[PDB]
Design a protein around this ligand. Structure first.
Ligand code: NA
Lengths: 263, 9, 81
């Protein structure tokens, strides 16, 4: 399946406003209030084809969003009895199989913490606390969920489909992980094995160590390589002389066959 | 095109 | 883990990355070579769990001699491992 997602942040400062858009794990647009002439801008080649009307509609939506988020920030201050800087984050996204909407998201956090989220039914809200219950009641009364659903099932699906056509050359690729194991004897006398997956796209991957058929492990987060691809590693500490009993297993949509690696 | 957060907190 | 430093390709013409996560905007990031401060920054964003991230990156030819790091105050060194 594929997703189209917007990640939005507003930050009060003793207010900066940013939007980023992604298809799957590729950023394709960005808006930043602190720019000299703030406007929506391309971050992938394939979106530059779009006409002037695309950019101006997007810029104007961003600017309206900015104003809504300034009110949001101010209101949240009141609900929580605060005086400092504060962040409101929003994510809105559709996940589509090949036209059916697998899953829709429309959710917010305040100061890094869950605030409110549209449920999987795309009809009801989950509020994190009694402040967020005030929003949930107002949004119930305004029919917010119906309009948010119509975006997620309508415009979001139709635009993802156009992006996937526009950027087909880059968006439909699957870059397999190139994997290897490194070995490091520790001054404590035992051995660190680390299983690396490099150069893969998309970001989703499974990386695990096994011993004698049983899953085991420090595992890092998928980190960007900077060129559109991802990296990940997983580590185990193993007794000296026992390295060969350990196998690293990697699965990723881009692979003819799951990888099994050993030192 | 993209999403509008019309409804305020 | 809030700071990771690593190369785009295994080193043997490459890019060094400094990847910073779990911070609370509004963070400062400096890359260093042999202790001495053209660094491109990604757009800040956040993960589905609301955790923020940013990538600072720089062009470099790795040498057996040279040390690199990223200062965020914490200096974190590039281990070629
Ligand atoms: Na993609």
């Amino acid at each position: 399946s594929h997703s189209l997602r917007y990640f939005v942040t507003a930050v009060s400062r003793p207010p900066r406003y940013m939007e980023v858009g992604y298809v799957d794990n590729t950023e394709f647009v960005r808006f930043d209030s602190d720019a000299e002439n703030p406007r929506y801008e391309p971050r992938a080649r394939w979106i530059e084809q779009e006409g002037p009307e695309y950019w101006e509609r997007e810029t104007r939506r961003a600017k309206g969003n900015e104003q809504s988020f300034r009110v949001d920030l101010r209101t949240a201050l009141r609900y929580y009895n605060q005086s400092g800087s504060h962040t409101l984050q929003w994510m809105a996204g559709c996940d589509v199989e090949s036209g059916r909407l697998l899953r829709g998201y429309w959710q917010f956090a305040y100061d890094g913490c869950d605030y409110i989220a549209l449920n999987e039914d795309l009809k009801t809200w989950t509020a994190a606390d009694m402040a967020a219950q005030i929003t949930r009641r107002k949004w119930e009364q305004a029919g917010a969920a119906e309009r948010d659903r119509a975006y997620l099932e309508g415009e979001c699906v139709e635009w993802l489909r156009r992006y996937l056509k526009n950027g087909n050359a880059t968006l439909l690729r699957t870059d397999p992980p190139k994997a290897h194991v490194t070995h490091h004897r520790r001054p404590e006398g035992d051995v660190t094995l680390r299983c690396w997956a490099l150069g893969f796209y998309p970001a989703d991957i499974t990386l695990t160590w096994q011993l004698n058929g049983e899953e085991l492990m420090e595992l890092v987060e998928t980190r960007p390589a900077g060129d559109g691809t991802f990296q990940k590693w997983a580590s185990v500490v193993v007794p000296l002389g026992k390295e060969q009993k350990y196998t690293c297993h990697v699965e990723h949509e881009g692979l003819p066959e799951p990888l099994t690696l050993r030192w | 095109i993209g999403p509008r957060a019309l409804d305020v907190l | 883990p809030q700071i990771q430093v690593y190369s785009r390709h295994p080193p043997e013409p490459n890019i060094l990355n400094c990847y910073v996560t779990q911070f609370h905007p509004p963070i400062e990031i400096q890359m260093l070579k042999n202790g001495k401060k053209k660094v491109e920054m990604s757009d800040m964003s956040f993960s589905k769990d609301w955790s923020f991230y940013i990538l600072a990156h720089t062009e470099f030819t790795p040498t057996e001699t040279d040390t690199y790091a990223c200062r965020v105050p914490k200096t974190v060194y590039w281990d070629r491992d």
